[PDB]
Amino acid sequence: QIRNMVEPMDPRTFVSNFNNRPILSGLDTVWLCCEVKTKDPSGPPLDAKIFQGKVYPKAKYHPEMRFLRWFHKWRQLHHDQEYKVTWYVSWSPCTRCANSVATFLAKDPKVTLTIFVARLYYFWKPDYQQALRILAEAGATMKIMNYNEFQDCWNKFVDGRGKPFKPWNNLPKHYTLLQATLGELLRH
Amino acid sequence: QIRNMVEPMDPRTFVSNFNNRPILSGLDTVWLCCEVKTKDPSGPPLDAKIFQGKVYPKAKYHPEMRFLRWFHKWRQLHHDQEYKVTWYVSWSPCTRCANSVATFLAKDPKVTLTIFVARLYYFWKPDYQQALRILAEAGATMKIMNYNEFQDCWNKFVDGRGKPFKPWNNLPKHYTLLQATLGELLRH
Ligand SMILES: [Zn+2]
Ligand SMILES: [Zn+2]
């Protein structure tokens, strides 16, 4: 049970940065909730951690970059086998980071990433639209966080204090918008 | 010109009821701006009108239903030829209105409708989704109002007032959302 493997983030912090209002400003931070497993989806969570970084460049200090460096040294300490990573990230990847995660997934065919985004990041600038396409073109499975993944993220990475998940009104309103957007953007 | 054929609506009313923030309810009414034309769209508009209806049932007082009765009476006064109707309605259609318009478009292969919605109405509830999916059958061309269609509507149906149309913030961002949602819902 990964609640001990990580240093769970604050409830007032989660409700703020994982709010899925598609157009939102005032959140300068992107929170990545990481989780490593084997080619199995049914066994134990093998390792887990929470990265965070601020959005202004350099992109070398972004929570998807902190992951890529961490997972490089971590892959060394464990045996060569197929891994299944999955992210619960607050904002979608930026443009430079999407290129890094693509070069990574390309070199290393044993890992297969799955990113759940709470919000799509600059879904209107066409640079960021091809960033999402770059990822799904490298093998990364891109999805929108729905009620289950918001809940499953609360249980696993928060000071839940046994408290159960409290969903805001307009969650599936925003979900239907964001899924359909990600659906159109990835379409080719 | 058609600013003369109708009873132009108020400027403060148009920005109010045609604002395209995908999520809205503080809005009790639905506004339908109609326009009938010939086979050739490069000709002038034959007639035009503004309907109104409150959003609560029965659907008999919905602005797309007042049209269906009005257009039946108007059809008689002219010779039979092919009409190209186009709506600029603020909310998308409800479920029962969509049945009317589908069966209506079915009786008369000479009419071809084009509906421009400013917002999708209850785009998350699953029946209101096959609601748009009906009109898509029986031929209705479904589209989202982008800036051009908002502008063209101000010109034709709004008491211009000698002040220019000022488009509201995030209009083409909201367009991306609603355009993506509608697109996915119609293939679904
Ligand atoms: Zn980045
Ligand atoms: Zn109706």
Numbering used by the authors:
A (entry chain C), B (entry chain A): 4 to 138, 143 to 195
Question: What do the authors of the reporting publication say about this deposited model?
Answer:
Members of this family catalyze the conversion of cytosine into uracil on single-stranded DNA (ssDNA) and restrict retroviral replication and endogenous retroelements. Among all the A3s, A3G is most known for being a potent restriction factor against HIV-1. Similar to hA3G-CD1, rA3G-CD1 forms oligomers, binds to ssDNA/RNA strongly, and is catalytically inactive.
We obtained two crystal forms of the rA3G-CD1 protein under different crystallization conditions, and determined the structures to 2 Å (CD1-1) in one crystal form and 2.9 Å (CD1-2) in the other crystal form, each in different space groups and with different crystal packing interactions. However, these two structures are essentially the same, with a Cα r.m.s. deviation of about 0.54 Å, indicating that the structures from the two different crystal forms, including the surface loops, are not affected by different crystal packing or buffer conditions. Since purified rA3G-CD1 exists primarily as a dimer in solution, we attempted to identify the dimerization interface. Interestingly, only one interface is shared between the two different crystal forms, which has the largest contact surface area of ∼726 Å2 (compared to other non-shared interfaces ranging from 664 to 88 Å2), suggesting that this shared interface is the dimer interface.
